[PDB]
Curated annotation (Swiss-Prot):
PANTHER family: POTASSIUM VOLTAGE-GATED CHANNEL SUBFAMILY E MEMBER 1, 3, POTASSIUM VOLTAGE-GATED CHANNEL SUBFAMILY E MEMBER 2
Protein name, per record: Potassium voltage-gated channel subfamily E member 2
Effect of residue 27 to C: In ATFB4; gain-of-function mutation associated with the initiation and/or maintenance of AF
UniProt key word Zinc: no
The UniProt record lists the keyword Ribosomal protein: no
Cytoplasmic side: 70-123
Provenance organism: Homo sapiens
Effect of residue 54 to T: In LQT6; forms I(KR) channels that deactivate twice as fast as wild type
Glycosylation sites: 6, 29
Protein family according to the UniProt entry: Belongs to the potassium channel KCNE family.
C-alpha cells in the first residue's frame, strides 16, 4: 500500500490553491518593485511609442510564421523509426553519482538552519 499515491492526489489540490494563491501573493509584493521603477519611468517618452511598435508587428509576424511552419511541416506527415541515444543508460550512471554528491551538500545546508537554534533540552 503506497499512501504516497493517494496523498499525491490531495497535494495537487493544495498546490493548485497555493500556486494560484502563490502567483497571486507575488502580485502584491511585486508592486514594491514597480513603485521603485515607476519612479524612473521613461524620460525619453519617444521610446514608449517605439517599443510599442516593436512588439506590434513582431507579434503579428510571429503568428504568421508560426502557422506557416506548422502548416508547412504539416505537409511532411512523417512516420518512421529512428534509434535514440541508446547510451542514455551509460551516461545516466555518470549523473547518478551527482545525486549522492548533492546529498552531502544538503547536510551542510541543512545544518546551517539548525545553527540558528540547535539546543534541545538538557539532561
Amino acid at each position: 500500500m503506497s499512501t504516497l499515491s493517494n496523498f499525491t492526489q490531495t497535494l495537487e489540490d493544495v498546490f493548485r490553491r497555493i500556486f494560484i494563491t502563490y502567483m497571486d501573493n507575488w502580485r502584491q509584493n511585486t508592486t514594491a518593485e514597480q513603485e521603485a521603477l515607476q519612479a524612473k519611468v521613461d524620460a525619453e517618452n519617444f521610446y514608449y511609442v517605439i517599443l510599442y511598435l516593436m512588439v506590434m508587428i513582431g507579434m503579428f509576424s510571429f503568428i504568421i510564421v508560426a502557422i506557416l511552419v506548422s502548416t508547412v511541416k504539416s505537409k511532411r506527415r512523417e512516420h518512421s523509426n529512428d534509434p535514440y541515444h541508446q547510451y542514455i543508460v551509460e551516461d545516466w550512471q555518470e549523473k547518478y553519482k551527482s545525486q549522492i554528491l548533492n546529498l552531502e551538500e544538503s547536510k551542510a545546508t541543512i545544518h546551517e538552519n539548525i545553527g540558528a537554534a540547535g539546543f534541545k533540552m538538557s539532561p
